[PDB]
Amino acid sequence: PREEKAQAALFKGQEYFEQDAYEQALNGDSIGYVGFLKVADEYSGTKAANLAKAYAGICYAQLGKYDEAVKMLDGFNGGDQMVAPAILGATGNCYAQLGQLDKAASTLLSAADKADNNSLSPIFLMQAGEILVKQGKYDDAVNAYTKIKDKYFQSYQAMDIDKYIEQAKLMKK
Amino acid sequence: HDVGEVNGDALSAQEYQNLVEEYTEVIKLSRGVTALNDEQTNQVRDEVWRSYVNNKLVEKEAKALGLTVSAAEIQDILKAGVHPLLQQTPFRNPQTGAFDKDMLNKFLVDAQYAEQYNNMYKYWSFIQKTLVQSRLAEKYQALVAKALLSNPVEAQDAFDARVNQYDLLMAAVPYSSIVDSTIVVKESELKDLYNKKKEQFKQYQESRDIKYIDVQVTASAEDRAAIQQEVDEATAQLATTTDDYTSFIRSVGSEAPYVDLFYNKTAFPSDVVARLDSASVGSVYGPYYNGADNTINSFKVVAKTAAADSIEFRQIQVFAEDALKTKALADSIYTAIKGGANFADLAKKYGQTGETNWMSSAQYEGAQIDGDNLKFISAINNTGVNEVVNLPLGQANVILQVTNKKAVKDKYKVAVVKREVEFSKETYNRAYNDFSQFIAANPTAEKMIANAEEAGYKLLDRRDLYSSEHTIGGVRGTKEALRWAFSAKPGDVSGLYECGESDHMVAVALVGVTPEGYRPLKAVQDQLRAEIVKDKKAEKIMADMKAANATSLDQYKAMSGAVSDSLKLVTFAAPAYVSALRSSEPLVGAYASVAEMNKLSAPIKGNAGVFVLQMYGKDKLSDTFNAKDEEATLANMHARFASRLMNDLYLKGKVKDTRYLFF
Known part of the structure; x- marks a missing residue:
């Protein structure tokens, strides 16, 4: 019944989070909801506390606290198709916010390989490709973008991908 | 199961x-x-x-x-x-x-x-x-x-791609300038491209290819003449009928029953409505055929009037142990009201509200109305404002008072003889016999396809039929034929299915199965051929450009089939429309975003042709970069792009759907 109590302590934060009310999702309201930080401490060991770390990491990033975001997102442990790669992708995007571009690109490429699907992999591959172009790493960008064209051809991004490949090829010069 | x-x-x-x-x-x-x-x-x-x-x-x-x-x-x-x-x-x-x-x-x-x-x-x-x-x-x-965040590199790129605008001259040779039959596509190249792109050609669910015949039985001439005769006889009797229309209209089996009440124009069959203005009260509007419901019809306007469509009334019901007491009690109540007793007060005394209500002809339009309902509704429509009536209703009485009338509309009584032109059993049996003779003489798909036309049957076609579709060819009651199609083998011909609304007959030939796995080469031949053709046309055009030693815009414009154009306000973000090619060319902006001013590009393989570009001008929208707003737009874009994630969960969910095997 520890999981049951943890889940009841979490659901109000899931409502705030969905309404973009990140401060109250993270630190609690004053009317009975304690916030994601206190859920993860009070009910550690439960699935609810593992989830709370993913939610809290996104809260920190939406609030502009990217260092805290990275530390919190790393605490999430999961291996599903959707949430875990998106959380890893969010970590790479926070690295980009901090100027750690090498770490951002490899994290995003990793998130794309972990997701391996049309809904998420192309999002992370595009973001990795744009960072690799900013670094002057044109062949690596072409490889990220070509992966969208080759493996994720049914995705929305594959409709538009050729202009990105061509631009990166033309910058080799 | x-x-x-x-x-x-x-x-x-x-x-x-x-x-x-x-x-x-x-x-x-x-x-x-x-x-x-x-x-x-x-x-x-x-x-x-x-x-x-x-x-x-x-x-x-x-x-x-x-x-x-x-x-x-x-x-x-x-x-x-x-x-x-x-x-x-x-x-x-x-x-x-x-x-x-x-x-x-x-x-x-x-x-x-x-x-x-x-x-x-x-x-x-x-x-x-x-x-x-x-x-x-x-x-x-x-x-x-x-969790699908943006970042400052992606935000700056999206802003740059929108606000940087370029102006460029273009010379292009369109792919249409090369005749298809001059490009040779070897089978070894189609096979190579297929194996290279094989993961793009998955068949997720088994599909089959069929041909089928769908016969509809319709009334013959002798069938229609026999029903024309019955409506002619019923029309003559309707002319000489003067009362009891409910019973007469039932007695000739009309599809449109008669109620002895006034209704708005809308309550009658639409083909009758269309004719009402040309009809005279008391005269049969003689037999006519209506295509939209396959009926022969006649009708008689029994009466016309202008009456209120909405009636306000209050009531009080009277039930008692027996008939003697019911009558005595209702007469007493009626007497009190006519002497000026308050209706609400008196109604409370027998456990009823006695509050006025409303009634519009729409609340009974369409219902079967008879017995006490017809007596009651007729009473309301024939009671004057403020008049009180003591209405006997078989077992009970009701003291009734109309208080108000509004919404005076044109209303009608219309007796309608409507008979559907249905086929006989003789007609059906003729069609069934011909069709069964054809099926038995052609019990293989090869024979059915080859001989359908000469026997008078239209052979219909359906590729990529899936077992979740419920019917063959949209015909009602063919789920058995769908079941049969997914258990048969190519070349088989089904039996004759009787279906529809006892008026259709279906036979199915199975021509091919595409099992789950990969679509075969033949199924995607055309898309592979067209890609190989485009690639070879682009090779030929670029070879011709090099043989011509074209190094300037004018030398490109001088080549066989060349067109030119001036492309203004090109951006990376939005694909350039190219009039000269009648085509959208997103590679124009890709080139422009990294191009040098006044330098002629190398040839570019586009969608409608091979083109060169020379930029001659540039500018920027004056918009200010806001990183937080740009990132919010991109974050929402990511959410939209991932909104179909249930499809991905479906693909890994190993979902099997065997519902067609049972219902």
């Missing part, structure tokens, strides 16, 4: 029956009607299956992550009353009309039974399970979506 699986967990035909049961009651109790037809029922079967599959897909992920909708959250949602699913609910406060959680709190205490409209617990139990399933999916989707 189970109807399918998702994630290695099966759904038995029993549970599937129960859920489609559940959903039908709910669909009837909300669309008004009390039964659905065969295509509506199929819609219900598919929604139940779709809904089951999506919730199973979400549950396996939610279980892994620990996403749940706890009893506490449900109580919270219920107390709030704002969820869209709690709006068009039965439980509503009597005055507010909004969801009241408190009346919902219902007892577990129900010869101790009394009545059984407390199967309402099963209805609410459905609303509540839909609530938690939908809240679970929504929690899951929102966690994925909100």
Whole structure:
């Protein structure tokens, strides 16, 4: 019944989070909801506390606290198709916010390989490709973008991908 | 025997029956009607299956992550009353009309039974399970979506791609300038491209290719003449009829029953409405054929009037132990009212409100009206304002007072003889005999396809038929023929299915099976050929450009088939429209975003041709970069692009759908 109590302590934060009310999702309201930080401490060991770390990491990033975001997102442990790669992708995007571009690109490429699907992999591959172009790493960008064209051809991004490949090829010069 | 699986967990035909049961009651109790037809029922079967599959897909992920909708959250949602699913609910406060959680709190205490409209617990139990399933999916989707952040590099790029604008001259040779038959596409190249791109050609569900014949039996000439004769006889009798139209119209089996009441124009068959202005009271509007419902018809306007469509009235009913007391009591009540006693007061004295109500002809238009209902409604329409009447109604009496009349409309009584032109059994048997002779003489797909035309049958075609489609060729009652098609072998011919509304006949030839796995080369030959052709045309054009030693814009414009154009306000973000090519060319902006001013580009392989570009001008929109706003737009874009993630969960969910094997 520890999981049951943890889940009841979490659901109000899931409502705030969905309404973009990140401060109250993270630190609690004053009317009975304690916030994601206190859920993860009070009910550690439960699935609810593992989830709370993913939610809290996104809260920190939406609030502009990217260092805290990275530390919190790393605490999430999961291996599903959707949430875990998106959380890893969010970590790479926070690295980009901090100027750690090498770490951002490899994290995003990793998130794309972990997701391996049309809904998420192309999002992370595009973001990795744009960072690799900013670094002057044109062949690596072409490889990220070509992966969208080759493996994720049914995705929305594959409709538009050729202009990105061509631009990166033309910058080799 | 189970109807399918998702994630290695099966759904038995029993549970599937129960859920489609559940959903039908709910669909009837909300669309008004009390039964659905065969295509509506199929819609219900598919929604139940779709809904089951999506919730199973979400549950396996939610279980892994620990996403749940706890009893506490449900109580919270219920107390709030704002969820869209709690709006068009039965439980509503009597005055507010909004969801009241408190009346919902219902007892577990129900010869101790009394009545059984407390199967309402099963209805609410459905609303509540839909609530938690939908809240679970929504929690899951929102966690994925909100984790799809943007970053400052992607924000700066999106802004740059929008505000940088370029102007460029173009010279191009279109692909249409090369005749297709001059490009040789070897079978070894189609095979090579196929193997290279093989993962793009998956067949996720087995499909089959069929041909079928769909015969519809329609009335012959002798059939139509026999029904024309019956309507002619009924029209002559209708002319000489002067009363008791209800019984006469029933006695000739009209599709349009008569009620001895006045109705608005709209209450009558639309073909009758279309003719009413040309019809005279008391004269039969003689036999006519109506194509839209295949009927021969005649009608007689019995009477026309202008009368109120809305009548206000109050009433008081009188029932007693026997007839003697009922009559004495109703006469006493009638006397009091006519002497000026207050209606409401007197009505309270026999346990009734006695408040005025309204009645419009729309509340009885279309219903079967007879007995006390007809007597009652006739009484209301023939009582003057403020007049009181004591109406005997078989077992009871009703003291009636009309208080007001509004909405005076043109109203009609119309006796309608409507008879459908149906085929005889002789006609049907002729068609069945011809069709069975044809099928038996052509018991293979090869023979059926070769000989259908000479026998007079239209051979229809359907590729990529899936076993979830319910019918062959949209014809009602062909689910057996669909079942047959997915158990047959190529070359087989089915039997003759009688279907439709006892008026269709279907036979099916199976021509091909595309099993789950990869679509074969032949199925995607055309798309592969066209790609290989484009690549070779682009090679030929670029070879011709090099042989011409074209190094300037003018030398490119001088080549065979060249066109030119001036492309203004090109951006990376939006694909350039190129008039000269009648085509959209997104590579124009790719080139322009990194091009040098006044430098002629190398040839570029586009969508409609090979082109060169030379930029001559540049500028910027004056917009200010706002990194937070750009990132918010990109984040929402990411959410939209990932909104189809249920499809990905479906592909990994190893979903099997064997519903067609049973219903």
